[PDB]
Design a protein around this ligand. Structure first.
Ligand code: MG
Ligand code: ZN
Lengths: 124, 69, 124, 48, 145, 97, 44, 358
């Protein structure tokens, strides 16, 4: 089991080697491929905002405080993403790993803190 | 415990320059000290580390065990 | 994660120690007082073959092999002698008496298994 | 069941090249639309 | 699964509606019938094809969920943002790679022929031809203005 | 034509219109058993943050901010009351059923 | 001490645990996970 | 001919002009120059070659090419009595594994004999990996600046058998050779993606479904190559990738030419409409070979009824199905022609590699 800091649990079931992992024209590839369908009902916007902020923090090489109830302007964070050289959204031109074919729609990829919940499959 | 020998995401050997980087960051914080207001982008790229989100993400954020125990 | 810094001295049960942890790229005030446990995984919010449907995650095999969320899990074995008649030793092949079928029974130098030795399912 | 699986595979293989994602900018209101939303909420507060 | 590093029970996503399950950490018991009588009964009576139509509500329980639903929408929608929703012969051929059925005949199509989004669906649905006519969930009057 | 969240919601893949409205526009009124937040804190106070016999709509669970805009502290407290009510009902479900 | 009659009632009693249910051999339990390449009537 | 337009190699070098970097380097390694092994970012332009072939070369250079790592022989980690408690064999073996080594000989064996007599926490850098085996290292195979585990006061760490293992990065990621740094098609126009309307799109003006790019720019970064021998090492890597592709394709061709005698890898049916279906099942074959075969078969047989492959994540095998309006002999001859086309393509690529990097 694996979870983010927004409480979005997830069982990891796929081991894709580096060649099979999708990548971007930058060369960045994901460690986890989270389904976008986990968001609209769970409504964990914190994970998305954390990804957007971490994309700019990693480029600037900083660490930012994202505590709850701090003043938050998602529009300004997206403008900051644009000013960091990325797109206004965190989306990037992504290439399918196995076929080498780019996706028609740009894919939102960025850093996100993830935790390994102590529910190991071998234990239970 | 340490900075990984290679970036977890893509396998770029950040571990080569990790030992230089911790000391460089320590002197950098000493010359200015918010706590993490510093922009280590230029400090990081001075070591040869390219403009990769993953490598810098795992380099500037990994916790050192010697700094805690 | 780093649940305790004196783990080699302690004899813990069902305790997992994760080698690598990272400060979140977007940290909160709660990390000024606790140690972060988890990595800043690059996560792509996308549909990749439908293997991440319904709270599943596709993990990079390279990320797993490189130490991502990989640590050591600790279990211990402990019993106490009922009385003087009970003692620790490799069992008497001559006497034997009520014994265990299979149950390799070797590797028990001076009654115990030496450190650094792999113990399989059936081993004693 | 077989057709469920086969149609599932057509959909997934199409997505394999079309790509699908959700972004923090997909949830972001343009400032004029934000003003419209705030005016609507102010109307509700005015009735109350 | 002859991969020794895999220890989880793997099921198709669309088969979760039978057990009301998700993959957030759920565990499911599995036992293999070893007697002849139980094996016969299991394959003839308790096969999941029997429970495709819900006993409770007389409708079907299974279908496309999440990525398959939106993937079908993207596949069958008329216009992509880049233009008409078409694919060449190679990609229409590749849509059928993982279906495991008998692949259709693309000899009528040159490599430069743009196969429509709905033509490839009709290629699959020809094996089980049906008649259906309803408004899609895509068309909603709330969004319509 | 390109919004992933809207395409998920509209095609019925996941989510509903109230989720989208809450995320982008505003939560609105919080209801616990088809009524506003009753003044449980004190005699006529819904929360320590609001005066006694408060008459503004915000004092009784009205959330002006959307999820993306960020909820303030009392708005978050009301949202937490509503969510905990939902968790309690879900936990009651297994036992009573 | 639990008498003879105390063994019967309640969930953990003789009836509701040993009679209406049972523990079995040749059964395995594990965590489920998705597999888009399995037929709906197939389990990994 | 021109299937490898122009290469470029920029090693990633330490910029000592930054005062902090130079001060730290000279303080704790006494280093004032570039390290013996540096990562170089090779950027390749391929023109007139299909996307499947370029991506297959990229995937091979990523993980499917053989590579070397430092590994500990079973029993190399000495338990002793005063070893460090925190530096378990798993952690240190993981640290040593992913050390990127450019080794030309597998007979080398290193040892890690570190002692912390002092009262401080002494760190073990990779310069402490002393070598006792075979030929003495005229040039080091790894940088001496890695941070192998630290030792508590009074604790030691002995690893008396560190040897070089060989394998492909598909099975273990410690063999992963080339990291990706770029991939793009030069024959497809791009939108100004900064603008709001094109912000949500990939950027290319052609749909991925219909586009068929033939001109690509592929950029791979290699983690450790010797500083004075950069270009020759890059050439050897690229030529070995071409060798690997050609060898796997030639094995497939051997199964193909052995079609007269029924073998489990290849079966043939006779469909009811005169069609013959070719099923090629190959264990532990990745998407590289399958995609190459599919692309080239479809390129030479435009009117093929069906060609497709499926590398299921389980079953660890590649299955390629070919359905055509031709007799079995004609179909076999055609697909052997496609195989020879692949072989020719990669031989031309390798010749261009030899005459391009120089
Ligand atoms: Mg569940
Ligand atoms: Zn990296």
């Amino acid at each position: 089991k694996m979870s983010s800091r927004s409480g979005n649990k997830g069982i990891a079931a796929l081991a894709l080697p580096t060649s099979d992992m999708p990548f971007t024209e930058d060369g960045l590839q994901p460690d986890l491929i989270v389904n976008p369908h986990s968001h609209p009902s769970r409504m964990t916007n914190g994970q998305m905002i954390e990804t957007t902020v971490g994309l700019a923090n990693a480029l600037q090489g900083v660490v930012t405080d994202g505590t709850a109830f701090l003043p938050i302007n998602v529009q300004l964070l997206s403008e900051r993403l644009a000013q960091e050289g990325l797109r206004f959204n965190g989306c990037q031109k992504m290439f399918n790993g196995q076929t080498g074919e780019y996706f028609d729609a740009a894919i939102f990829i960025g850093p996100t803190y993830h935790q390994r919940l102590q529910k190991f499959v071998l234990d239970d | 415990m340490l900075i990984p020998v290679v970036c977890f995401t893509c396998g770029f050997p950040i571990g080569t320059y990790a030992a230089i980087f911790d000391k460089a960051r320590t002197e950098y914080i000493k010359t200015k000290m918010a706590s993490l207001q510093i922009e280590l982008k230029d400090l990081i790229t001075a070591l040869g580390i390219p403009m990769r989100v993953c490598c810098r993400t795992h380099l500037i954020t990994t916790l050192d065990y010697r700094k805690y125990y | 994660g780093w649940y305790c810094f004196s783990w080699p001295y302690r004899v813990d049960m069902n305790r997992f120690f994760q080698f690598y942890n990272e400060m979140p790229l977007v940290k909160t005030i709660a990390h000024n007082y606790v140690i972060p446990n988890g990595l800043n995984t690059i996560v792509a919010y996308m549909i990749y073959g439908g293997y991440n449907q319904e709270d599943s995650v596709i993990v990079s095999q390279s990320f797993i092999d490189r130490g991502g969320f990989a640590g050591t899990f600790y279990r211990e074995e402990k019993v106490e002698l009922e009385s003087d008649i009970e003692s620790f030793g490799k069992p008497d092949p001559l006497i034997t008496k009520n014994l265990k079928p299979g149950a390799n029974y070797e590797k028990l130098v001076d009654g115990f298994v030496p450190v650094g030795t792999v113990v399989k399912k059936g081993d004693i | 069941l077989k057709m469920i699986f086969a149609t599932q595979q057509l959909a997934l293989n199409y997505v394999r090249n079309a790509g699908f994602t959700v972004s923090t900018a997909d949830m972001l209101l343009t400032p004029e639309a934000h003003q419209e939303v705030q005016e609507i909420i102010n109307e509700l507060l005015l009735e109350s | 699964l002859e991969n020794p590093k895999i220890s989880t029970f793997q099921m198709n996503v669309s088969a979760c509606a039978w057990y009301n399950a998700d993959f957030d950490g759920d565990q499911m018991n599995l036992w293999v019938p070893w007697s002849v009588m139980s094996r016969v009964e299991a394959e003839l009576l308790c096969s999941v094809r029997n429970w495709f139509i819900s006993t409770k509500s007389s409708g079907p329980v299974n279908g496309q969920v999440q990525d398959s639903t939106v993937g079908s929408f993207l596949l069958t929608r008329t216009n992509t943002p880049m233009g008409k929703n078409v694919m060449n012969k190679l990609h229409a051929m590749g849509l059928f790679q993982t279906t495991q059925t008998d692949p259709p005949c693309f000899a009528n199509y040159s490599p430069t022929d743009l196969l429509d989004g709905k033509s490839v669906v009709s290629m699959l649905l020809r094996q089980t031809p049906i008649n259906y006519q309803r408004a899609p969930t895509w068309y909603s009057e709330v969004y319509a203005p | 034509e390109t919004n992933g969240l809207f395409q998920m919601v509209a095609t019925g893949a996941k989510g509903s219109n109230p989720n989208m409205i809450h995320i982008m526009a505003g939560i609105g009124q919080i209801e616990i058993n088809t009524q506003r937040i009753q003044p449980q804190f004190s005699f006529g106070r819904t929360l320590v943050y609001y005066p006694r016999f408060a008459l503004e709509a915000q004092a009784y669970g009205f959330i002006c901010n959307s999820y993306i805009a960020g909820l303030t502290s009392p708005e978050f407290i009301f949202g937490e009351m509503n969510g905990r009510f939902d968790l309690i009902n879900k936990a009651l479900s297994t036992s009573s059923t | 001490a639990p008498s003879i009659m105390r063994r019967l009632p309640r969930k953990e009693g003789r009836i509701r645990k040993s009679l209406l249910g049972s523990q079995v051999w040749s059964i395995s339990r594990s965590t489920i996970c998705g597999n888009s390449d399995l037929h709906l009537d197939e389990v990994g | 001919e021109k299937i490898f337009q122009n290469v470029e190699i920029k090693p990633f070098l330490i910029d000592f002009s930054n005062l902090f970097i130079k001060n730290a380097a000279k303080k704790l390694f006494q280093l004032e120059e570039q390290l013996p092994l540096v990562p170089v970012n090779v950027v390749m332009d391929f023109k007139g070659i299909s996307r499947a072939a370029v991506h297959g070369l990229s995937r091979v250079l990523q993980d499917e090419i053989p590579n070397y790592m430092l590994d500990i022989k079973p029993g190399g980690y000495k338990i002793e009595d005063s070893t460090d408690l925190f530096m378990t064999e798993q952690f240190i073996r993981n640290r040593i594994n992913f050390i990127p080594i450019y080794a030309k000989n597998e007979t080398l064996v290193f040892a890690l004999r570190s002692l912390n007599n002092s009262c401080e926490v002494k760190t073990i850098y990779s310069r402490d990996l002393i070598q006792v085996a075979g030929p003495k290292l005229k040039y080091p195979i790894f940088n001496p600046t890695f941070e192998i585990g630290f030792l508590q006061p009074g604790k030691s760490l002995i690893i008396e058998d560190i040897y070089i293992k060989k394998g492909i990065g598909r099975k273990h990621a410690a063999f992963n050779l080339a990291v990706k740094t770029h991939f793009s098609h030069l024959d497809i126009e791009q939108y100004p993606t900064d603008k709001k309307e094109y912000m949500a799109l990939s950027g290319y003006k052609q749909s991925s479904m219909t586009s068929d790019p033939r001109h690509h720019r592929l950029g791979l970064c290699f983690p450790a190559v010797p500083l004075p021998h950069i270009n020759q090492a890059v050439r050897t890597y690229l030529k070995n990738a071409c060798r690997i592709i050609i060898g796997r394709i030639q094995s497939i061709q051997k199964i193909y030419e052995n079609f007269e005698e029924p073998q489990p890898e290849l079966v043939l049916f006779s469909m009811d409409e005169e069609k013959t279906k070719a099923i090629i099942t190959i264990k532990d074959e990745t998407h590289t070979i399958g995609n190459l075969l599919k692309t080239y078969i479809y390129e030479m047989i435009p009117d093929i009824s069906f060609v497709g492959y499926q590398c299921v994540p389980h079953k660890q095998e590649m299955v390629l199905t070919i359905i055509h309006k031709a007799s079995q002999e004609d179909l076999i001859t055609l697909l052997e022609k496609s195989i020879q086309n692949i072989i020719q393509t990669f031989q031309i690529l390798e010749k261009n590699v030899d005459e391009l990097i120089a």
